[PDB]
Amino acid sequence: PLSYPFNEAVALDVDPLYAKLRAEEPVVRVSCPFGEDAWLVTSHADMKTILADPRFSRALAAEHDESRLTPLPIHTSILGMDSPDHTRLRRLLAKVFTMRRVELLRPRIEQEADRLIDALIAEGPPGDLMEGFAVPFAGTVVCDLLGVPFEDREQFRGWLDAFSATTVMTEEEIEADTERLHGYIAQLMVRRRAEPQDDLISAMVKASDEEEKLSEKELVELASVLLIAGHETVSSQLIDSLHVLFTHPEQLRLLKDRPELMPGTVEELMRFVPLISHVTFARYATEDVELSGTLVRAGESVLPAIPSANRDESVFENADRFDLTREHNPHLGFGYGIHRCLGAPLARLEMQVALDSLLRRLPELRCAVPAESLEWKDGMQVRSLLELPVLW
């Protein structure tokens, strides 16, 4: 069995093996850094099957030593459940995390992007689009929506890596930091139960309390994943997307000249950015299933290599090319099926507002160093820059 990951992720380079596997052996047995051996799945079509077909279970991972890249299984809350418990949380969350609520955030989101650019200009070039834009932009937006005080970021930001770290933290540190975040949210919940605000933690507590829909621990773990997705995943995708744009200047000039391309541009960035470093969370087969010629037996695990699916030449013409005009884009960057991203409307709003604001306010935006000089954050389940120095 091949040792997986084959190679540590470098910048946004995709490992050439995936294209070889997609063409010659789309499903391959691997050993994982932790837990049971698994079947790596590489193709778009098989990705949809393992993500959405009910013969594949997230909740069954709990009955295994879960195939994974993290030292401990992650507390993935709703993303670790099947029906019926998944339906229960999906419904509570959908009911409070509505499209209307998100769209009504637009003036505040736009204002926050303007305020961050104001500070960049006041402080003078070069600016860091990571710590000086993407991080505080995503942070203030999710903190506002969830109800986690952004002023507490100095306390909680240090615990988030525990939910994502592969090689760089010990079990003992992951457990400790996981406890710290869970316990921080639980304290917040006591305040929000007694003193509701216009935020998701308050709405969730109210819905759960008035229907006894969820246990306190379920509410804690669910709010925690929402904080992580809003804070870490959004800022990672955003900074990575800025790198793609700077490293494909011709597409950047096009976007600046044709701002009506933004919605398709954000979708192409979702596809093209290999955001997930390797795979998302493993599923287990409840019965035998054949995938691209390989028999996956009942009780065996599958690793969904979503970024490789988004480079599937059989689904996207010139899948190795970044083209923000791309019309056919059934990308899986927001997942697919039962666990597909509930945050996608919010993430698309943020991506669009952030990119449009920077290009409208900073027409001459360009990366201030060569790509070779950039420092990436290694040992995590998503890729991100640590700094993106820019000029304007």
Q: Residue 218 Cβ, how far from ligand HEM at the closest point, in Å? A: 13
Nearer to ligand HEM, 241 or 251 (CB): 241
Q: Residue 334 Cβ, how far from ligand HEM at the closest point, in Å? A: 5
Q: Residue 136 Cβ, how far from ligand HEM at the closest point, in Å? A: 15
Phi, psi of 295 (to 5 degrees): -80, 120
Nearer to ligand HEM, 156 or 281 (CB): 281
CA 192 – CA 31 distance, rounded (Å): 44
Closest C-alpha to 228, from 166, 105, 146, 110: 146
Nearer to ligand HEM, 127 or 274 (CB): 274
Count of residues for the chain? Answer: 392
Q: ∠ at Cα 354 (383, 90), nearest 5°?
A: 70
Structure-block tokens of residue 267: 């979708």
Q: Residue 235 Cβ, how far from ligand HEM at the closest point, in Å? A: 9
- What stretches of the chain adopt beta strand conformation (E)? 2-3, 27-31, 38-41, 56-57, 127-128, 283-285, 289-291, 294-296, 301-304, 366-367, 389-391
Nearer to ligand HEM, 69 or 226 (CB): 226
3-state secondary structure of 56: strand
Contact 337, 47 (CB under 8 A): no
Residues that bind ligand HEM (CB under 6 A): 51, 78-79, 90, 142, 225-226, 229-230, 233-234, 237, 275, 280-281, 306, 333-335, 339, 341-343, 346-347
Nearer to ligand HEM, 78 or 262 (CB): 78
Question: Is 341 annotated as ligand-binding?
Answer: yes
Structure-block tokens of residue 244: 């793609």
Q: Residue 99 Cβ, how far from ligand HEM at the closest point, in Å? A: 13
Largest alpha-carbon pair distance within the chain?
61
Question: Is 283 annotated as ligand-binding?
Answer: yes
Question: Is 86 annotated as ligand-binding?
Answer: yes
Question: Is 248 annotated as ligand-binding?
Answer: no
Q: Which residues are annotated as a binding site?
A: 86, 90, 280, 283, 339, 341
Where is the binding site for heme b, in residues?
Answer: 86, 90, 280, 283, 339, 341
